[PDB]
């Protein structure tokens, strides 16, 4: 399937691709927004008559998008959600067209046995719903969040790169009777500047900031109380993709010390496919940013990566806009937002 049909009917595909490839598009949220807009454009314009064929077309589009860029998960997720939204309505329609029992909301046994309408507006509304969801995660978190941390305790903070995490911290810091001391690891060849910014913000906020060299984690772990990951994406068996560098080692340390690890994210960040590898998903940075020189630097083959993967085991809770979930449980949440056939396009 090529862009042969999508020409003077829809244009912005190419623009999207450009944004993906050269990185003029920045932050998962923005990508998601872009995808939503694309979907809106698709809907306001494309010509149907049928329904299954339309679904197939949409699937193909999704596939194409994936092929254009994989690290953008939000894009995929939103598409999947909208497909799911459509699907339920389609199912409802079919029941009226033809003219049922199940123990709970969905079934395994309904997959074994043999099983024109106004869906477009519903589809439109789905997109709006998605947009609204995207709008605020934090305004559905800080009620399950300004609860866990207490007085005279000590936080450990890797990945000051997810805009959500900072906000979460600051909401907690707001209270005039609650007090905590904050340790912040750097993350060097991908995060330093961000970390510095975060530190500055903390200082501004009138709270006790502590700047840490990425080495010196072990000389302070005796006093450590909590662990917060600044993840970018979330997956099937619980685990997360993170907004780059200096998270994995610290998590491992925490696990060794048995010092609690929390995950703060969102369900637009939530994805309906397994990270069978880290290799196919997590991408690498630029060897140029570490060291100068070039002709002795054909010999100096240096390795540095942007994104970070963490195994399901070290992390314990995923507090959402919906509420507190677990690595064992998050799969069902995903299923509650994207349907069973939508997993594979």
């Amino acid at each position: 399937h090529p862009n042969a049909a999508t020409s003077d009917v829809n244009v912005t595909i190419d623009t999207f691709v450009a944004k993906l490839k050269r990185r003029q598009v920045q932050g998962s949220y923005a990508i998601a927004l872009e995808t939503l807009q694309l979907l809106m454009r698709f809907i306001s314009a494309a010509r149907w008559n049928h329904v299954n064929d339309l679904i197939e077309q949409i699937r193909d589009l999704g596939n194409s998008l994936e092929k254009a860029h994989p690290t953008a998960f939000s894009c995929g997720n939103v598409i999947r959600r909208i497909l799911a939204v459509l699907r339920d309505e389609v199912e409802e329609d079919t029941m009226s067209t033809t003219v049922v029992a199940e123990p709970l909301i969905s079934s395994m046994f309904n997959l074994l046995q043999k099983p024109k309408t106004d869906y477009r507006q519903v589809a439109i509304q789905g997109i709006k719903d998605l947009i609204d969801e995207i709008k605020n995660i934090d305004e559905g978190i800080q009620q399950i969040a300004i609860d866990l941390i207490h007085d005279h305790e000590i936080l450990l903070t890797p990945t000051p790169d997810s805009k959500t995490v900072l906000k979460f911290l600051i909401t907690a810091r707001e209270r005039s009777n609650r007090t905590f001391t904050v340790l912040v690891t750097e993350g060097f060849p991908n995060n330093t500047k961000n970390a510095h910014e975060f530190a500055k913000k903390l200082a501004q906020h009138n709270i006790e900031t502590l700047v840490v060299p990425d080495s010196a984690v072990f000389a302070l772990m005796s006093r450590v109380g909590k662990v917060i990951i600044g993840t970018k994406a979330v997956f099937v068996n619980g685990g997360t993709i993170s907004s780059n560098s200096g998270v994995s080692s610290v998590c491992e340390c925490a696990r060794e010390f048995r010092t609690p690890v929390f995950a703060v994210a969102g369900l637009y960040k939530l994805s309906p496919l397994y990270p069978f590898d880290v290799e196919k998903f997590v991408e690498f940075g630029g060897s140029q940013r570490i060291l100068p020189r070039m002709d002795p630097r054909k010999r100096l083959d240096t390795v540095n990566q942007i994104t970070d993967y963490v195994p399901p085991e070290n992390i314990d809770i995923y507090i959402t806009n919906v509420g507190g979930f677990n690595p064992s449980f998050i799969y069902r949440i995903a299923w509650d937002n994207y349907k069973q056939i939508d997993v594979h396009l």
Partner: protein
């Protein structure tokens, strides 16, 4: 007389015990000081190469030089204000950069020597024999020991190798170089660096100066690094009464990682470095330094950019602090290579009373 007071930046809250301040730029002092000590202090303070092994050697050399230059006064005997002078030197050293365990040992040895030949002798006969003795001692307990360690290491490698490394351990540099050159094996070297002082970079440079197959990375960049690769090596500074690894910075995390990922670690040690001072934490007594070790914005050392940060005393409520010497977990590093070839660090003080 000297200079005290006027210290840079905020004093934070925790880890408030050790000297970290001071004479960086000189302004009036006492009037009979030999300047070589002062020069050395100046060097050590603004040093980006030294790492446990060479400092003590340098100190020894300086002392030798002093002895050679030493003139016995026409009035009083060979040790009257000499002790005072030595004390002053010590004070200066401490003000500049703390006396390490090796330095303490050296001081002890000096004191012993002072006691050995008590006041009764002239000049060019006593110090003639002293200087030679000390040279011989240096030859014995240091260089030969290092050689022994090297040769132990040589056998320790069997068939096929892929290694990850850290630290400005002169001995380790020697080791790896030896592997590369006069052993001609299939020796792969991966380097880890650190922000407080650039040791990893130096190591890499040294490797290049041989033409080694080198990968290079840092403290965080590790999770991908293991995706075949087996060996891991470290370079400790000192071991206490406890058997704990009281060394420099970025070691412990790496060690932990290695432990987690199946294949163990090995460190190297010297048969003089052990102490009877007892501690089990980083907080007790540490190499603490000025936060100027964290001002530069990546890439190199001399660049100086007006980007986002560049202030400390004007930053209201901000506590920027870093540590240099750590205390690594006891059970984690397996093999230790001292004078008696091989052994478990559960030994701790097995050579301490042996002296």
């Amino acid at each position: 007389p000297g200079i005290s007071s006027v210290i840079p930046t905020v004093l934070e809250q925790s880890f408030d015990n050790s000297s970290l301040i001071s004479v960086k730029e000189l302004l009036l002092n006492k009037d009979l000081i030999h300047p070589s000590i002062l020069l050395l202090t100046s060097h050590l303070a603004h040093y980006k190469i030294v790492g446990s092994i060479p400092r003590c050697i340098a100190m020894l050399e300086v002392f030798q030089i002093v002895i050679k230059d030493y003139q016995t006064p026409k009035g009083t005997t060979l040790s009257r204000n000499l002790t005072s002078y030595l004390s002053h030197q010590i004070d200066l050293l401490k003000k500049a950069r703390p006396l390490s365990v090796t330095m303490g040992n050296a001081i002890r040895w000096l004191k012993q020597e002072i006691s050995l030949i008590d006041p009764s002798t002239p000049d060019k006969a006593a110090k003639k024999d002293l200087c030679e003795k000390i040279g011989q001692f240096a030859k014995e307990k240091i260089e030969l020991a290092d050689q022994l360690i090297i040769d132990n290491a040589s056998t320790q490698i069997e068939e096929s190798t892929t290694i990850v490394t850290y630290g400005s351990s002169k001995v380790l540099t020697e080791l790896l170089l030896h592997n590369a050159i006069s052993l001609k094996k299939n020796i792969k070297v991966i380097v880890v660096d650190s922000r407080p002082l650039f040791e990893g970079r130096k190591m890499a440079e040294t490797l290049r100066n041989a033409g080694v197959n080198v990968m290079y990375a840092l403290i965080t960049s590790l999770d991908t690094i293991f995706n075949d690769v087996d060996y891991v090596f470290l370079g400790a500074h000192s071991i206490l009464s406890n058997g704990f690894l009281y060394s420099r910075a970025g070691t412990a995390m790496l060690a932990m990682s290695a432990k987690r990922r199946n294949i163990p670690v090995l460190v190297c040690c010297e048969s003089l470095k052990f102490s009877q001072r007892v501690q089990l934490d980083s907080v007790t007594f540490n190499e603490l330094a000025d936060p100027n070790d964290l001002v530069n914005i990546d890439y190199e050392n001399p660049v100086e950019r007006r980007g986002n940060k560049g202030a400390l005393l004007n930053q209201f409520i901000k506590e920027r602090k870093f540590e240099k010497k750590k205390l690594a977990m006891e059970n984690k590093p397996k093999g230790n290579k001292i004078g008696g070839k091989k052994g478990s660090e559960g030994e701790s003080k097995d050579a301490s009373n042996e002296e």
